Structure formats: C-alpha cells, structure tokens
Amino acid sequence: SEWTGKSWMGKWESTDRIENFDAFISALGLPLEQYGGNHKTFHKIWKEGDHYHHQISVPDKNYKNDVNFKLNEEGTTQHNNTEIKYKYTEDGGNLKAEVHVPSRNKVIHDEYKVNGDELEKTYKVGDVTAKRWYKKS
Amino acid sequence: SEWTGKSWMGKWESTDRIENFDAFISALGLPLEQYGGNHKTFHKIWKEGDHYHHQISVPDKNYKNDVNFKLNEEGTTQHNNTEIKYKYTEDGGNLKAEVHVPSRNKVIHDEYKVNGDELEKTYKVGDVTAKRWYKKS
C-alpha cells in the first residue's frame, strides 16, 4: 500500500458545495431518496503494487463500494445485480473514469480535478452535468 | 436545410495539421496503410428540420458516409456487416459523439471544437488521443 504519488490519491470528503447532482441522479434513472441529496461522501484512492484502489462510502446510506483499477485497463464491478464496466485513465493530469452500465444503456463520464487540498469531481451522463467538491481529510 | 446556428455546422476540409493520428488508428486495430496518413477528408454538418446530417467523405478512398442524428438520441450505422452505435451531444458550444464498436469492444470519443474559422477534431480511445484540424471550405 502507497498513499502518495498522484495528486488525486488520498482521503477526500464531500463539502456543502454541490451543483446539479439530483438532476444527474435522475438522469441515471435512480430514485432520488436513496441516491440524491448531499449526504457525506468519502473517496479514498491509494496504490497497491501495480494497481489502484478506489473506495467510495456514504455512511448515512450505509453504502460502500471498493473498486480495483489499473490505469487504461477495463474492469468490472456490480451495484446490486447490475454489471458496471469501467476504465480509469489520466488525461491532462486529471483522473477520469469511463463508466458504462450496458444493461441500462447509460454512459457516465467522471473527472477528478485537484486544486491543492480541494478536489472537484464532475459527473456527466447524456447532456446532464453535475459537480461536487471534496476536501482532504 | 439550415447551415448556420451552431459553430460546428458547416463544410469542413482537412488540413496538413494532424497529431498522433496513426497511434489512434493502431489502438483501434486498423491497418495504417489504408486508414492512416492524412488523406483529404471532408466533414459536412447541417440541420434538416428535426435532425442533423453529418456527411464524412474521403475521396481518395471512395468513402462517403451519410450519418443522421438527433442530439441526445442513439443511432446506428454499419461497419462490415456489424452495428456501430453512436450518440451525439452538445458540450456547451462543441459537439461530441460517443461511439460503441461492440464487435471489437471499443468505445471511441469524437469531439468537434471550433476556434476559427477552424475546427479541431479530437479522437480518443482509452488513453490514446489524436487530433486533426479542419478549415471552412
């Protein structure tokens, strides 16, 4: 395990700064009660040998997802029983995630932009764009 | 027929300016001697009432493909005898196409960004990015 090496590695927690996130959740066809709002969300990203770990948690919703990824290599995970295909890449020095949910014909473009101890995440699906800001912790 | 109303609408013609294009074609698994280089290429994009036409032509290669699209709506076109899926969206003032090649398990990003007078097309598949510049015909 390594916790340094890239600006986007570390332990990030959401702030009150959020833009259009319910519209993004709705564009995913998900119920706003369970998936929307601005509940405390954590992103932890670190390195393990030749690959990376990305753990997303929302403790309010008792929700946790641990993602293994190698840069530029397709991976597969699940949310309940829906398969999610993803590929993380570095582009312009930002971390990007290409996230496909083929059984729901949904493509999500995630982008992580670091500015000091702040992380700005952009979420895009179809023509809907949302942003959330995170701080180091 | 309407030829104005979006910066990317018009008749565009390739220039000598091109960047990393053969690496993009290679990452797609296509022969360079037939699909690489910088052969004269035209993109014509215009509106027809309730949809757009996007015509791509490479006269040296006897290639002419008439794509019809509605923004935010998935369409299909043929390759060999297999289906290619696309969906065009606006990213503010620019045009983006999300392309699935299911036979080959590839996802291609196209972007059309107008700066002049001049159109910059970006092609991206995984971590490989290429660019080509077009001038108004």
Ligand SMILES: CCCCCCC(=O)O
């Ligand atoms: C697979 C993409 C090859 C198309 C080449 C012509 C173009 O620049 O759009």
Ligand SMILES: [Cl-]
């Ligand atoms: Cl998909």
Ligand SMILES: [Cl-]
């Ligand atoms: Cl897919």
Ligand SMILES: [Mg+2]
């Ligand atoms: Mg988040």
Ligand SMILES: [Mg+2]
């Ligand atoms: Mg072109």
Ligand SMILES: [Zn+2]
């Ligand atoms: Zn370890």
Ligand SMILES: [Zn+2]
């Ligand atoms: Zn809530």
Ligand SMILES: [Zn+2]
């Ligand atoms: Zn691991």
Ligand SMILES: [Zn+2]
């Ligand atoms: Zn997909």
Ligand SMILES: [Zn+2]
């Ligand atoms: Zn460049």
Ligand SMILES: [Zn+2]
């Ligand atoms: Zn994509």
